[PDB]
Amino acid sequence: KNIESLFDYSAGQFEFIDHLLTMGVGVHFAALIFFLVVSQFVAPKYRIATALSCIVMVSAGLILNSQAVMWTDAYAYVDGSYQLQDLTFSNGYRYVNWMATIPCLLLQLLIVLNLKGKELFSTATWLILAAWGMIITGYVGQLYEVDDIAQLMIWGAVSTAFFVVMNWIVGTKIFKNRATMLGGTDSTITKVFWLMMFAWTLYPIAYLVPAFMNNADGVVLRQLLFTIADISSKVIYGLMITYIAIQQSAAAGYVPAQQALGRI
Ligand SMILES: *C\C=C(C)/C=C/C=C(C)/C=C/C1=C(C)CCCC1(C)C
Ligand SMILES: CCCCCCCC/C=C\CCCCCCCC(=O)O
Ligand SMILES: CCCCCCCC/C=C\CCCCCCCC(=O)O
Ligand SMILES: [Cl-]
Ligand SMILES: [Cl-]
């Protein structure tokens, strides 16, 4: 049902995809350890943001590693190419884990924006509904990514609509809660917002790929468009969100955040 099943792969194509995915496990897991060690310098009020990023890292990784084992499971070198065998490869769990990588993500954004209580719960609720709603509409079209391209174009459209609409919630909360933010990070939070738009349009670029490049190199470009997406929405919003918590902790008088910044 997915263009990946349609082709045989050069050895260079199959190896590049497999190193891509593996570089992936490597980075989500190495960043996994950074995210743990530095959590002891984040003040109690922000320390979950730090934590939330370990879930991101270990969702991702576990499922990224899943994809690379399935890639080698699915294909075997036969008469001069990698041909599809008895098991299949697909990108379902990405998505299926898109569906949960994000709650925790906008959650640790919302933490460092200093929201608390009811605005925090309420904002997170609407956000999860609409991201989730981007995530799932987009899931029903890549399902048609071979059979019915106008169903890619139509589900695409609707997911996008959901994407447009959700960057408004986040936009608004950021520009409205900038002023709350400590130790200089009111400037910083505007970068993460932008940082954040780039990686997430990579994925619609990553979706119209059957529509505009249905061949084996397109399969490759998807996955490339996949590994970067991931170093940014997961690994580098990751970090950037983390700096903000530590800086705000120092600004609010938390001595291990103060000493941590001082050391460097
Ligand atoms: C791993 C983390 C994140 C934040 C992934 C977010 C995904 C998007 C912004 C994807 C959007 C889609 C749309 C807008 C277009 C058609 C179908 C998609 C699911 C690829
Ligand atoms: C075997 C997997 C292939 C890649 C090996 C990965 C291990 C080294 C990767 C680089 C570290 C990831 C980025 C930096 C971690 C955050 C710590 C920091 O920025 O101070
Ligand atoms: C911003 C995220 C950083 C992601 C780094 C991903 C690294 C990709 C590395 C360089 C691409 C060079 C590709 C050469 C591939 C040719 C493929 C082929 O064999 O046909
Ligand atoms: Cl605190
Ligand atoms: Cl994922």
Author numbering: 2 to 265
Published text:
In this study, we focus on chloride ion–pumping rhodopsin (ClR) from the marine flavobacterium Nonlabens marinus S1-08T. The conserved DTD motif (Asp85-Thr89-Asp96) of the bR family, residues 85, 89, and 96, is replaced by an NTQ motif (Asn98- Thr102-Gln109) in ClR. ClR structures at cryogenic and room temperatures clearly reveal an architecture composed of seven transmembrane helices (TM A to G). Cl− ions are transported from the extracellular (EC) side to the cytoplasmic (CP) side during each photocycle.
